[model samples]
Target: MQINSIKIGPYINLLPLQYIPQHKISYVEFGDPKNKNIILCAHGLTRNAHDFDKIAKELCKNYRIISINYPGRSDSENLKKPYHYNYTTYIKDTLLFFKRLNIKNPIWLGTSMGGIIGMVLASKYKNIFKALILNDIGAFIDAAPLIKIGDYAKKTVLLDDLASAKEHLKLIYAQIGIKNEEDWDYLTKYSVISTFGGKYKMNYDPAITKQEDVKLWSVWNKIKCRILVIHGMKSQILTKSTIQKMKKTNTFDLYEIKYAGHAPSLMNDEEIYYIESWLKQKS
Candidate 1:
């Protein structure tokens, strides 16, 4: 249960890997690691575990929050084969991740790609998750959003300076729904890494766009646990028609953030309160 590195937080090295290099999966553990009350979080495509920093800090006192960085994102290593960057591989890695942590029946909170993984796992392994929280993603994602994301994913943009990087991120992720300047700065700071020649590039592998067909209505239907779906009001990914259909197919609670797009940043006090209230209800 010990990570050899002197880094100040929880980190793990995946034994064997299909896509990642030695598959280093880094995660941030909040509160007591041994506490039975656990909340496992997964981030969206091209995002890292830092996405849940605010929520984890807020809920750490009462719950153990473990947020993960998918391979090729943030501190994790890139895959040897670009073709291996698909949900099938991610799902397999995640299952093994849970096993390595000895986590059982943890509440699952996933964003976009992460949500899809949660749905698939919850459907396939009935007793693994106690509840599910889908953030700005649902069974039927719109093609328009996928196309937009794909376009951004394929292009490798290297910025000359931090100011340029901030602008680039603001334009690319305008729909992320961050409320203030501090949150924006935090996201921009972690979203990119300093490369050769003092240039900055996104931390994730661009090849992830190669596998972007996200239709999982059947798998979503198979999930038997209690579910909470949080969608951005202006989200291009989760459309109104799709949310309506989801309502018809499953009994779940739905919360929508106003004036938000593809995803809500989940940093605002109101948003955090809503999530905390929902988690309390589950308890």
Candidate 2:
């Protein structure tokens, strides 16, 4: 199999956790730091900052893009106590980043768990974000799919070679369209790490799979910022009923991606187009 990976620009950022001692989150910045328009890109539960490489590079021309990796994921250190991996802790870490960096009224681009964080914080805090781009997540999450992913996240997967690693990732993220072998390689690049003897292991911490019962209709109602919902048509998490209810409650634009499920990797041209166009409209 041919091996190819996305050549991301640079990896230079480490935000110290004010709350959690001796732990810092890894982040990547794209475009000019002086730009007033900011987009905070937060990855899903197991994903990291690198997931935003493509979209960030494209969008950062106008909007400064900052992608963050939570503790125990990507280049970030693990919390010795796994329980701190909850939403409250994540929220604080986010707030800390904002306060220390002097970032005011930036847009939020969150996928899955990241989207939930935006929703949660948007409800509790005011004027923190100018807009929200929620990718394949919402206020209410179903238990069945949640349980399935939770089970999968709790266990570690170790494989013998890159080909096997790619196959395994494809099986789980099959719904997420990887258009070509190059795309598969890009997906596999950040998902796993090479070990000794040509072995590979999932890069994220298994303990970060901490998810509690989440229902946030009241919180959703409190979210007043401009919002856009990106849904994978075949996603188990973002169902038709939920989308309908969300539309009724809050007025927001929705973009449903074909040939994708659970989440759109946001690497495809059309996917990035919708997001950039929507951001333009809001601006």
Every model: Cα RMSD to truth = 4.3, 6.0
lDDT of 1 by residue, 1-283 (tens): 1111111212233444442334577777788888898998899988877888888889988988888788778877667677667776777678778777878899999998888889999989877888999998888876766887878777878898878988898888788777788888888788888987999998887766653556788887788998999988888899888889887778889998887887888878788889999989857
Residue 260 local lDDT, model 2? 92
Off by over 4 Å in 2: 1-19, 210-213
- Give one digit per residue, the lDDT tens place, for model 2 in 206-244: 778654656889988888899899988899888888989
Q: In angstroms, what RMSD does candidate 2 have relative to the true structure? A: 6.0
Q: TM-score for each prediction?
A: 0.90, 0.90
Candidate 1: the clashing residue pairs are 19-79
Q: How far off is residue 268 in model 1, in Å?
A: 1.3
